[PDB]
Amino acid sequence: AQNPNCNIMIFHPTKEEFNDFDKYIAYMESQGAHRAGLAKIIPPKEWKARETYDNISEILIATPLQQVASGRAGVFTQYHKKKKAMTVGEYRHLANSKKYQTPPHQNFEDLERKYWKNRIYNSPIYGADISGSLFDENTKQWNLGHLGTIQDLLEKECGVVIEGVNTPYLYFGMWKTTFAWHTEDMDLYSINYLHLGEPKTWYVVPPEHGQRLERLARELFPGSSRGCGAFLRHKVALISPTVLKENGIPFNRITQEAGEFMVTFPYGYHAGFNHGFNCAEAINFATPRWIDYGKMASQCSCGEARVTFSMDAFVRILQPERYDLWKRGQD
Ligand SMILES: O=C(O)CNC(=O)C(=O)O
Ligand SMILES: [Mg+2]
Ligand code: NI
Ligand SMILES: [Zn+2]
């Protein structure tokens, strides 16, 4: 078995190897990359996502989210308070202000220390889940707006034709902006490209150990756990690396820098934070190996997690028994 310790692998494809997305994903998994739940892909030195980022300030962040934390430094929830719309220009200016900017620090490790020590005492503002793309339409390789769609994958593998579309989302982050512990909708893959700015640190639990994370989360967030059998789908819970180590949860960590891709694999729980002003683009995707994960994925039926138009059809076809009660939570 490849990668038995489930370490995060880092790939350096050639421009030749970067031409066929599906085949490179299949390659990574032949080397055991999926066992970690997360891989990094450094694009060939000749590749670019677009020529410059000079004109992005006019993107609108229609609903910035102020991420308000409750709990203790290593175990907290966050609630997203909706703020007034602002442009990316305005946001970047806000991220760079004295109140919100990245503090002085020695290196990534010192900054990680400061994040976990001090996160709860500040409420950074996140521009998340904005439909759109920053890839140039002439970028042909690893263009997150030109991937084959999950609906087409399900059609090719399973023969069923469904409604729905699959498009990317932009995330504008600042220091301390946080993504809580989650897997993807329907335990899909994700791919994330860091277009510009400061890094993003990731924590990940190997898919084969995901249930151990869930068991800890039920113990750490006991009221949430009673309210919904899949409350991690709410994307509100944070657990520090220190806490994970204390409870023997297997995990890994890695820092993504501008110009790099990350791929999360089915049922790879991940969480993380932003080091400073940045912009990432991400999208979900599927492969043939995903299908069984999609069949077994948990669902939020309490009605908090409230998920896309396209997810309906995945639940309808892959989880027909759930379909009934799940759409009660989604209606
Ligand atoms: O970048 C972020 O804020 C969150 N991204 C993801 O969870 C992902 O790409 O799967
Ligand atoms: Mg613009
Ligand atoms: Ni994710
Ligand atoms: Zn729920």
Swiss-Prot record:
Positions of post-translational PolyADP-ribosyl glutamic acid modification: E16, E17
Annotated residues for binding of Zn(2+): C228, H234, C300, C302
Portion of the full-length sequence here: 11 to 341 of 523
CC cofactor: Fe(2+)
Catalytic activity entry: N(6),N(6),N(6)-trimethyl-L-lysyl(9)-[histone H3] + 2 2-oxoglutarate + 2 O2 = N(6)-methyl-L-lysyl(9)-[histone H3] + 2 formaldehyde + 2 succinate + 2 CO2
Cofactor note: Binds 1 Fe(2+) ion per subunit.
Binding site for 2-oxoglutarate: Y126, N192, K200, K235
Enzyme Commission designation: 1.14.11.66
Gene Ontology CC entries for this record: blood microparticle; chromatin; nucleoplasm; nucleus; pericentric heterochromatin; site of double-strand break
Alphabetical keyword list: ADP-ribosylation, Chromatin regulator, Dioxygenase, Iron, Metal-binding, Nucleus, Oxidoreductase, Transcription, Transcription regulation, Ubl conjugation, Zinc
PTM: Ubiquitinated via 'Lys-63'-linked ubiquitin chains. Deubiquitinated by USP14 with the help of TRIM14 leading to stabilization.
Domain JmjN, chain residue ranges per copy: 8-50
Positions with a binding annotation for Fe cation: H182, E184, H270
Principal cellular location given in the protein's record: nucleus
Protein name: Lysine-specific demethylase 4D
Compartment(s) of residence: Nucleus
Similarity remark: Belongs to the JHDM3 histone demethylase family.
Start and end residues of each JmjC domain: 136-302
Organism: Homo sapiens (Human)
Statement: the UniProt record of this protein carries the keyword Metal-binding: yes
Biological process per Gene Ontology, one example term: regulation of gene expression
Gene Ontology terms for molecular function: chromatin DNA binding; damaged DNA binding; histone demethylase activity; histone H3K9 demethylase activity; histone H3K9me2/H3K9me3 demethylase activity; metal ion binding
Role of this protein: Histone demethylase that specifically demethylates 'Lys-9' of histone H3, thereby playing a central role in histone code. Does not demethylate histone H3 'Lys-4', H3 'Lys-27', H3 'Lys-36' nor H4 'Lys-20'. Demethylates both di- and trimethylated H3 'Lys-9' residue, while it has no activity on monomethylated residues. Demethylation of Lys residue generates formaldehyde and succinate.
